[PDB]
Amino acid sequence: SNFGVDFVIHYKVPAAERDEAEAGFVQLIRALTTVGLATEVRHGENESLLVFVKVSPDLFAKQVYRARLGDWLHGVRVEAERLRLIYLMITKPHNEGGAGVTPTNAKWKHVESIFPLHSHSFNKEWIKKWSSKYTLEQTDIDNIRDKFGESVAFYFAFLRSYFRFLVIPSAFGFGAWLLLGQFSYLYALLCGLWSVVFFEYWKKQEVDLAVQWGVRGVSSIQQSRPEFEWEHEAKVYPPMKRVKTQLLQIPFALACVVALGALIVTCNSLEVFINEVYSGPQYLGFLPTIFLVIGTPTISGVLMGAAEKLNAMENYATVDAHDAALIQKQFVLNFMTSYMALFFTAFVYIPFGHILHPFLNFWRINPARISNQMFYFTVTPQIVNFATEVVVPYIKQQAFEEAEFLQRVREECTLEEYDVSGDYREMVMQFGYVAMFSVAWPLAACCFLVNNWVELRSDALKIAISSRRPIPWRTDSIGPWLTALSFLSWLGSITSSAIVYLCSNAWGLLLSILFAEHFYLVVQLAVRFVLSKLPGLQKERKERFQTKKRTPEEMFWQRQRGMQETIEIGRRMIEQQ
């Protein structure tokens, strides 16, 4: 159990520059005590001064009231909220209610990060409860909300909904595999319909969850990025410079396209070479695909590093815009590196495979090859992700008065900050696989379902012991990933459909693509209309109802009288008629 410590700051103090660190440290303590936070300083590991800060209940209550009033201002209207408020008062510059200690913008370059402490007593209980169940009720998601903020709870709710909705993919995929053979248009139509209904129902459930948790309209609120650099003060930046920096993303995009496409082209060429000339023992015929998948995490990580460097050099005023741009770049890179192989196999080799002949000549036809390639690109990448996610940190950690608490905090500081965008990206990639290439191997979704049941626990374990406690945040939605999902769905509505024509056989292909796209749009509109007729609206309506309960013309008008003589002349005129 913790000692009531709310937040911990590292403040590494290296031997070099040991003349301004003390001044920065004393300024940090003075500023942090100015906002009224109790502090305690202890030693750490490798010349570090770990400072633990906590809350005078009157000031905390005043801050909570101010935050609630601010939320009421924007129309928005527990451990997570308290920790969030403490972090906000720690981070918000001293301009209005806080003291700037951001480790990026101002002079606080000697601190690593500010993180909340992790409670092992709750963590072990949560892990045991989640691993001893089969399905997760809303109480578990509510507990995740109350402990690890709103973003983590939103991600876990999305994962649970996706895993639950994947049960029908597996159902009719197994049905098609057992009976409908391979490359059936009906399976593609059912997959598109499921993607549409899943997207719409997830949006509805997400709005319901936002209403329940009281985080409606949080996305509208804009939070300034401390790392943002301005030039004038109207804190403004020239948009021309921003678009100039953005234009750098284009040549990077084409360069990565060329590099990855060339790599996949050579791998495909050599694999078809060895499949055509080597008798082998089947399994060895697709070994380059497994090798490419195994190497995918390294190049993906270096590409994510390059993308995050580009985003950091791209000045963004607010947190939301920076996050959206980073998500867009990461999604583009992952889509590329995880789908170009299948795209080349399906829409390049299958329709016209005579263009790869020069590669075969340098080294020294079967529609069914895409099915095996999709089987591999479904089974093995999730295994590699599992290995790099859960079991390799296990190996790394196995390789390595109140002193035990200090040792626990010191070991916690080395743990990297847990991020949610990575898990969202993995889930979006899996959904794209399902929506775009399940026709080649209908069983694939089923496998993903199994993986999801592990992931919904495994990622939880990733939060527990392999990472430090995430900083609570409020997000109205899951972010731009939402839109990304829709895009993938639309792409599936073409992609899989075209595959059905390509692996079973010009005019027919275009007709099938057009029909599938129009059917996708029709069912999208139909499901949107159906869900428009159906939660949180009743609670909002009840809240709204409860708040609710909380001279010619003078002679003409002075002709006879008021009411009585009027009806007198009424009967008079009736009789005259």
Added chain:
Amino acid sequence: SNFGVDFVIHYKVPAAERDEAEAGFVQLIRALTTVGLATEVRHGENESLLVFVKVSPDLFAKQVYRARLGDWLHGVRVEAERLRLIYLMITKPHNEGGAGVTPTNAKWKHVESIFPLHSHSFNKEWIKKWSSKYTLEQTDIDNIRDKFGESVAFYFAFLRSYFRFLVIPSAFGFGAWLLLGQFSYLYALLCGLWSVVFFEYWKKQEVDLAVQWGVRGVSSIQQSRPEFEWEHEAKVYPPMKRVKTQLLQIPFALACVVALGALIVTCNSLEVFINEVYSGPQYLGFLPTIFLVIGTPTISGVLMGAAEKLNAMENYATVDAHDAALIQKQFVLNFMTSYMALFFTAFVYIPFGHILHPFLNFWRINPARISNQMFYFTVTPQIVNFATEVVVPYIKQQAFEEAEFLQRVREECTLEEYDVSGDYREMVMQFGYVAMFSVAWPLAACCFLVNNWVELRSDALKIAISSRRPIPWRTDSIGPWLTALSFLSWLGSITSSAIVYLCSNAWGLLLSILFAEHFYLVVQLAVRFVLSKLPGLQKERKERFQTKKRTPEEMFWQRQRGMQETIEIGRRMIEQQ
């Protein structure tokens, strides 16, 4: 000038049933005086008792305050508003603030309608000002808002925006006609882009106008229809009965499809017969098209009567749903009766004209025919609409103490109530023509532009003298017509494109259709994003800003001190390091 009379009620009193009319009349006077309205009764024409009602300023001010409070409840927050409030207090049943005098539901079957008086002094000035100008400023639309409510102002603003945006259609249509010959893909792409940008900019301007007029969120408010009939009281109706009545619209739809399609098929067959066998004098070769257009208003009117009868027999709880259903039916019928001829000419006769040969045999090839057919279906239907709109009521009216004021009101009562859905339907049909068939005749849009300049005045004149004063209403948007417009745009993105392939020549047609649709979607997303970066938001933000300003752990924490000894041990640990 009027005598200060606010509203007028007819209350026809025929010779038959002259025993309950007097009781109904006395009940009407008592109920209307209960809500505090001065009344005056005079004779009319053909056994009618015209009653004029006006407002005690205290009660009117109280009603205005109550209405403003109700608008504040729903988040929404001049002669038109005053007249609307008077009509609301006249119509709202006596359950809460009013007295039910609706001429449909309750016993008030002896009254024709309740209408506001028309001011000729303002009307003649407005007509002269609009006819003496070239372009209309926002002041004219504001005056229309303050006089004839919000729906009329919204319609006139939409017409003005559409006429202004039609100037580029005419520009590049004349450019293509002079240089690019006929059936150019570039013209189709430009037409689709213009449709997209016009739709998006009209939505933006419409939101801006709603913000300016303070009618934001009015569409969310639901108004009960007095004619609605219920069975239980939870005022509810079984949805199964409603869908059973709705299902009747399907066989009616196919029956009208069959009838109109057969009529157009015979007309086309006979016109091609006479064009192939009769030397004539060209103009006489398309005479059946002119005859069909001239007969179109009669069948369109009978079909609108059938559709409104079906809608009336279809019980709708609220005004908004009833209006949406009626608009949907009317739009479907008009789309059918005004576009099936062109659709048959373009996508049936041109691709495979050998199926009409049996009709030619019973009676007893050229891509360029669609251009002439579109020329006729652009020039002559607007002429017929003009004839049936402005000049025929002119002929009808030429054929036919304070007594002159009474005579003026009596002549006003015979005038039919002006509706806006008809003008919206005409404009939507014109926009559909432009978006779907301008490739056949690029000059068509230009002609429409000219007509619009007349229409923006002519329809105004239709309000002035050929119809009674419309009852003011608030509408947040232009209604389901909005969505209809989008549909037409999408259809154009296919239709015109296909025409380009059909009049210039299977795989190519499908490729062109797919490319045009995808280009339309791409520019739609691009224009939506561009407009998302750009009004009323600043005023809302300023209003929002203005409203804003309106024991181990005890020993651990009690280790040394508060601030000072903390920094003492801070330097101590720094030195120890």
